[PDB]
Amino acid sequence: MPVSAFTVILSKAYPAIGTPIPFDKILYNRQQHYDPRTGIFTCQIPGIYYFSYHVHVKGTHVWVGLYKNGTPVMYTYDEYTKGYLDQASGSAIIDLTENDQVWLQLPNAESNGLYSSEYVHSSFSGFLVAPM
Template identity: 25%
Template sequence: MGGSYGLAVLVGVALLLTTGQCDVSCSGTDGRPGEAGIPGRDGRPGAKGQKGESAVMDSGPVDASVLLRLKGEPGSRGKPGVMGPKGYRGDLGPTGKPGEPGRPGADGKSVAHGEHSPQQARSAFSVMRTEQSYPAFSQVVTYQSTMVNTPGDFNTGTGYFTCRVAGVYYFTFHSVAKVSVCLRIASDPPFNKVGFCDYNRNTDQVLSGGVVLQLTAGQKVWLESFRDQQKEADARDTQEKQIIFSGFLLFSNSE
């Protein structure tokens, strides 16, 4: 009885093993590939490496590209050095080609008309008295030599300057004598006379004077001697003397 029960169990196990086997044609379907996961975060920076050794200069030719890669940061600007001596001037270069003519300028404006144009508004004279006699008191001084008389406004025979161009003039005189001399510049009204005297007791008496006058056309200007403190012997003196009388136009009234 017991043997029959054990046989039955063995048969049952054999049946279970037989029914659990699968034929080759009963394989399952392949699974799908899995999806990519989310990117991970960056890792922490690594530790700083040690400083490298200095480059060794090669004895051969230097590669410029290598030098550029090895170039360091620019340093701070240094102080300016002492200025060197001035160099020698170079030779003059050849003459350049002439430039193109410029544009014509604008027409000028006329500043004066009539007989007193800028070309005619000029007057100057300088005459010299060389007579050894003392110039007579209260008489117009006359002259024997003419240095300048342009355009001829001074009359050497009469000793008068006659204003032709109205304007401002400057008159001056210089005299050299061995006795005291008094001279004055005179003109028609409204100006009258201004006198100068020299009483120094040197061997040669030097006298000079000058005046600026506003003149109208036709006015006369002259130089004359006058009596002040001279001695009688001075008026009779016949030693060498020299008187120079000069005048010129500073500017005309039309300017």
């Protein structure tokens, strides 16, 4: 019965570093547990969730982390070969309680080549696997 899911896309490239990436294009976010203006997902239903993210790389390297309450729980890295775009993904099962927050963020200003556009979709998704 309990349901929570979302898939958001970034319409513009090179988000600011050291802060939640504000994916603004909504593909699905019916329960509104993800906030487009903050780029943060807030848990309302306790349980284990599955998160997945896909980023495109261009201009420079990309180092991105999946954060939980301000702490990085997973890092994904990919290097840019001059003149060629690349794509990198990551995913993880995370146990969440009410008010817990999850988001994506670029920790370092040097590896910030996160690319996205109307035709190249870097995205972020998540959904409740089992209520607990």
